[PDB]
Design a protein around this ligand. Structure first.
Ligand SMILES: Cn1ccc(NC(=O)Cn2cccn2)n1
Length: 191
């Protein structure tokens, strides 16, 4: 989770897409889905990011619908956004023990218990928090087994980005799980 605000310059693809769904939350606008191989993914928008301005115009108070409308009505040449980095999220760094554990249970993406004397316990991981990213990679909408596999196939150092479930559940509402599993970019970033 980086220092406040950054600007991004987008550019509709050949189909007039940017690869983005937005969600109105507490009178802001937040990123709900970022499509793989899209302008939004290429410029590095993330799930949970706040969109402060579009084309210089403030997003405060908008409906999802208006934000989707605004994106349609826009010369594809150059769209500028002002982004606050995943404001609802935090990142925790952990270390595995000899038996390859961080020290928690989760279910449906949501952490449900911390294990005594684990790295997770020492680092202050919280339950009732949906897992959003592991080592910079978005795992929302994946299955527990696949998240479990990403954790198994990480180095010793695991970095997890987590979001309070109440907020998470409010963000992904009206979003079909399959679309999340399919289209939400789950790739390591590109250089
Ligand atoms: C409506 N809806 C879409 C997705 C969803 N739940 C999850 O994605 C759970 N999860 C969090 C991280 C990994 N899976 N609900």
């Amino acid at each position: 989770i980086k220092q406040g605000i950054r600007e991004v310059i987008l550019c509709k693809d050949q189909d007039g897409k940017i690869g983005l769904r937005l969600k109105s939350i507490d009178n802001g606008i937040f990123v709900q889905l970022v499509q793989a191989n899209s302008p939004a993914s290429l410029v590095g928008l993330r799930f949970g990011d706040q969109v402060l301005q579009i084309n210089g115009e403030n997003c405060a108070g908008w409906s999802s619908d208006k934000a989707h409308k605004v994106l349609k009505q826009a010369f594809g040449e150059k769209i500028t956004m002002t982004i606050r980095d995943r404001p609802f999220e935090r990142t925790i760094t952990m270390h595995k023990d000899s038996t390859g554990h961080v020290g928690f249970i989760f279910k449906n993406g949501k952490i449900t218990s911390i294990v005594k004397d684990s790295s997770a316990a020492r680092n202050g991981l919280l339950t009732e928090h949906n897992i959003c990213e592991i080592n910079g990679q978005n795992v929302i909408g994946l299955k527990d087994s696949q998240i479990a596999d990403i954790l198994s196939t990480s180095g010793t150092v695991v970095t997890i980005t987590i979001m309070p479930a109440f907020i998470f559940e409010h963000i992904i509402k009206r979003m079909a799980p399959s679309i999340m599993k399919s289209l939400m970019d789950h790739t390591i970033p590109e250089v």
